[PDB]
Amino acid sequence: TSQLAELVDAAAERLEVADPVAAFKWRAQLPIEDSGRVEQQLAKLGEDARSQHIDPDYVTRVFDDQIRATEAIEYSRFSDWKLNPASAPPEPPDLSASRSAIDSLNNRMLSQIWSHWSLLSAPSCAAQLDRAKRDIVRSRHLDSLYQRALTTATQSYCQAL
């Protein structure tokens, strides 16, 4: 079992927030893209990292990858719903629960990153990450779209110094 499995599990769970958010933005006629919100989120995560004496640039690259992967899922859903608007699913009443989940999963990922910092900077990181993705793809039943998203979201893990 990979030492990175808890981190990868948290990243995959965070990817899953794309579906309620996409459904909500579709029904509410809101854009997927929000560059100002991304800048504010990444700046805050860089400051959370600095508060814990973690390298902020490593953290903000990781979370930019994660956010791009999340947005990619939302764009894929919008493509499906453009082809068949009747298939757009019931959306959550609001995004307060999604905001809470994202905050919780941000914290879980950052704490796992620091907890395994020695491995993330070590030569075995890539192998350990491959193993973790495989196991999480199984345990969370990830389809082709989420598998690609997980690859994108984790592509900068083995960059820690």
Partner: peptide, 14 residues
């Protein structure tokens, strides 16, 4: 995607 040239996102894959 969308980002200003001074944004954090501008430093990375985008």
């Amino acid at each position: 995607x969308q980002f200003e040239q001074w944004h954090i996102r501008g430093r990375y894959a985008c």
